[PDB]
């Protein structure tokens, strides 16, 4: 299967464009970004306050995902 460390904790599937919270938990931007708005300003897992000014790109995980998209059959 696709590894746990390549997946988010909102849609529980492969991330392509990750951003990481103040708590160190990573989500795929395009969904989690609207979730902080369309679900509300809190962290999915710990439920503490969380906004769009605090959530930042995870460049290290972006390179890790590319390491599989570039060769692996998961596509």
């Amino acid at each position: 299967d696709i590894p746990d460390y390549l997946c988010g904790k909102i849609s529980f599937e492969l991330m392509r464009e990750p951003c990481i919270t103040p708590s160190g938990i990573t989500y795929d931007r395009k969904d989690i970004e609207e979730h902080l708005q369309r679900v509300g300003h809190f962290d999915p897992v710990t439920r503490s306050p969380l906004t769009q000014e605090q959530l930042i790109p995870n460049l290290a995980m972006k390179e890790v995902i590319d390491a599989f998209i570039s060769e692996n059959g998961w596509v």
Binding site: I10, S11, F12, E13, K30, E33, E34, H35, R38, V39
Partner: protein, 222 residues
């Protein structure tokens, strides 16, 4: 604003496949769910909802059995591909955007028009036509309330008039209702002076144009 545009028709025979799209204006798939829903006539909405990539892992266990309600998408853009179809799959199908996650958000931001999808192998069928008369002038409300029962016919449209077109000014048509058999039921009422109950017997003329079936009946109290 954002808009959607759906295809019309939707008429198939049993075991065929339906293939259509819904157009997206003001955006594209990425960053949102994009999904369908359906409403069978006389009932509410039923799920064809939350999209996960081209299909879904978050569905209604009660719907995804028969031809697995296979609407889904084409390269994650709006589409429908329903194969080996039957009469029980009849409904009006809609396209829309909303939220995301394993979650609808709560909004469904944009909607389409609805596709009128229906399936039947049957030829056009004329009604069984029967007269309806009042029991007395007191119970009919002083004036004469005369009618006719038009039942077990398909499709929905049917012409009901009186006295070969001579009596139209007081004639009213009730809406047709679709039953679980696939056939329709309809009635009419016409109001005339109560002095005609014992003077002139009335003829109701029923003509099912989709089949050319014309059956007339005479209405008087008994």
């Amino acid at each position: 604003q954002v808009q959607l545009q759906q295809w019309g028709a939707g008429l198939l025979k049993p075991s065929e496949t339906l293939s259509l799209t819904c157009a997206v204006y003001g955006g594209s798939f990425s960053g949102y769910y994009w999904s369908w829903i359906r409403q069978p006539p006389g009932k509410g909405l039923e799920w064809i909802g939350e999209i996960n990539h081209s299909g879904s892992t978050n569905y209604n266990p009660s719907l995804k059995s028969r031809v697995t309600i296979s609407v889904d998408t084409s390269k994650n853009q709006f589409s429908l591909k329903l194969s080996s179809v039957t009469a029980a799959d009849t409904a009006v199908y809609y396209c829309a955007r909303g939220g995301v996650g394993r979650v609808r958000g709560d909004s469904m931001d944009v909607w389409g028009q609805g596709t009128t999808v229906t399936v039947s192998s049957a030829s056009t069928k004329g009604p069984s036509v029967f007269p309806l008369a009042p029991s007395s002038k007191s119970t009919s409300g002083g004036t004469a309330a005369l009618g006719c029962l038009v039942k077990d016919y398909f499709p929905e449209p049917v012409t009901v008039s009186w006295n070969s077109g001579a009596l139209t000014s007081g004639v009213h048509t009730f809406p047709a209702v679709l039953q679980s058999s696939g056939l329709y039921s309809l009635s009419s009422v016409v109001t005339v002076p109560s002095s005609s109950l014992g003077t002139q017997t009335y003829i109701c003329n029923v003509n099912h144009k989709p089949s050319n079936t014309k059956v007339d009946k005479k209405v008087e109290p008994k």
